[PDB]
Design a protein around this ligand. Structure first.
Ligand SMILES: [Mg+2]
Lengths: 163, 163, 163, 163, 164, 163
């Protein structure tokens, strides 16, 4: 019953959400390279959490009787200017994923692929948090600015991120 | 004491109530194909419920004495143009069943078969809900229309109905 | 993945399974007429049980993307020579169903439709138990023969079946 | 509000229920003598039930204003050929008492004493079970016939009746 | 389905049942003003109960596909001579109300509206208990006479009624 | 003690509280006649509550010895434009009755009838919640407006109210 088109559309978003994780992981290697262990953890946990959103979506596609192919994965950025510049790339990148989702939500309703539509809600519900929690840090990394005292303070705060 | 005409007239309503149930069963399959689980549930429970009407009357005919001969069952309509359409066909059908019963009611008067009269008062009452519950669900769909979000909101509501 | 060949073959099983139920309901009447209240009970439980064997399949097919259409149900044989002749029709009918199932399972391997193979193993098991639950009682009714009392004893046993 | 024609016709039905009670009580005596405890149990129970049916009407008459007088009660039969014949008298009398009620149902329709008509539907819906239980047993005693071992099985199954 | 003539005829009985409530509420106020709390309570319970009968019927109309329209309610009697005259009024009011329903029970049969006939059979029973309750009290207020210590006994006996 | 003027002014509030209840009931009929079962609930609950605001005061006047004369009640509005207009009429109406309480409260200060001034403080706190709960709704139906989906979402929410 699921459409040929939809399975294709979804297959790009599985293979995109895997790219998200591979990116954040690179950011962990960057935050590992400038001594920030909490930021490393936050990303290390982000890398895991994104992986599971693709796997939730992988499973769904297999449940509805669609076949999942996996295409190659691009080289993520290995370098940034500073912590603030990394989180500006995060915020921007999740906002692009936010719209990439809203498109599937539209495709699902145009086809009346209801089962899919309800399933995607979880990602419409999720992204609000990923956007807002990115921005919360982006605003703060500006407000803190060049002071290292407060940067290491926020470093420890993000070390306690789990799941 | 129970007349031969009654036993014939009833065996037809037992038979009719089973089709009334089978008809609801197919709508379930319909609503599954167009992805509406709660609309299907409603049907599932309705199929079950009408099947108990048939048994109620099955046992009455046996207790009263009459012998129950079962006729073959016709193939129900399997497709409808929209959910709205579907339920309009349901209302009409139960209004039709309301007629057949009100008839049997007068046939119990005009034979002076009081036992049967009183038995059938349940179905006189019962049908007041079947009409009303099905019309409420029609009205709603007309009021909703092609806003498919408002369709799902009601799909969930009908997902709750329980036996 | 489910091939159309299976979705057809299964819909036939469903429709045959529902006829199974409708047949015992007819026997429950028969056993109602001649006044064997446990024998009728036994049937009313098998009507119900066989009924749910059909909804198990219904949910599977629907859960797997196939489209379920409900065909016409044939009138059942409604009179038998005796309790023994009744129960010999049950045995031979269930021997026809047992065999009808093993033809599906073979198909399910040919289609390498493993999902359906495993789903059908429950129907294999449950036919061993209906074949032998029938033969326990066919044999007993012969052994009992025309002894009125034994019959009434066996009746009282059969009235304790609940599901 | 109640009429004197209606009050009068009721007191005979009360009377008539109490005789039904005495009659049955007299059967319990008979079934005692020929050495059947289970038919004595069945009778002693029906004795208590018929007796309660009258009181239900007694309280209704006293609730309606009317004054209840009690008349002398006839000697009930004391002897019967067989347990078979001793149930065929019960069928015939509970057939006559149903009839007796249906009259009282008609009386109320003419006088537009909807209060009484509406009260009597208990008895219309009750008397079904009274004719059926009676017939169900009547039919079984023909099937058994001269098998005393089966008579004592049926005897036992009628020993479990309560309240 | 449901006739126009019924939908108008039932909206009367709603109002009529709502008036039966307002009456019985104003009979409490009276008993209140002469110090009887048991008699007051009985009416306070009844006030709800007939209001309960009203909302039962309001629902049946709305269910059957009819529009309900609520008229203005008449000012009820405020005073009586005694307890006995109060409860002779209650017995006489319910008997008129009971006939008012037999009218609907017949009018239903006429329009072959078996769904209504059925629904109304509950009131036909119910009103049997209204008339018997009131007449049970009326006969008790006669036999008592002016025995104001019998009066206060019977007062307490009616303060054990409860609505549920 | 209680004054003649204070007892006159409370019969007015007892009789105005009832008209409020009768008004809310007639709004439950309006919301029923356009299919909104959650809104009808909300009005029925209100109908009941306001009636208990009356009886609370009905029992205070009787407790202080003063009499209760019950006048006739005006026919309330039957029809409205929309759900928004139906709740704009409610909000204006409860703000009339509030000001009306605020005049009585004064009447209690003026005359040094503190046992009443006290009693009424309960209405002074209540009307805040009567006005606020109405105003929170009035604002929502403007924001919603013609989106039938969100009309039905708000409808469902109201269906849960209970006292
Ligand atoms: Mg993401």
């Amino acid at each position: 019953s699921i459409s040929e088109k939809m399975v294709e559309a979804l297959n790009r978003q599985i293979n995109a959400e895997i790219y998200s994780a591979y990116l954040y992981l690179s950011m962990a290697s960057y935050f590992d390279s400038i001594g920030l262990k909490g930021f490393s953890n936050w990303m290390r946990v982000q890398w895991q959490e994104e992986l599971c959103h693709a796997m939730k979506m992988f499973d769904f596609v297999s449940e509805r009787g669609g076949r999942i192919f996996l295409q190659d994965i691009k080289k993520p950025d290995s370098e940034w200017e500073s912590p603030l510049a990394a989180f500006e790339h995060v915020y921007e990148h999740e906002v692009n994923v936010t719209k990439r989702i809203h498109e599937l939500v539209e495709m699902a309703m145009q086809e009346k692929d209801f089962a899919t539509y309800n399933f995607l809600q979880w990602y419409v519900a999720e992204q609000v948090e990923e956007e807002a929690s990115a921005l919360d840090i982006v605003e703060k990394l500006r407000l803190i600015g060049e002071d290292k005292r407060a940067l290491l303070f926020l470093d420890k705060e993000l070390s306690l991120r789990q799941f």
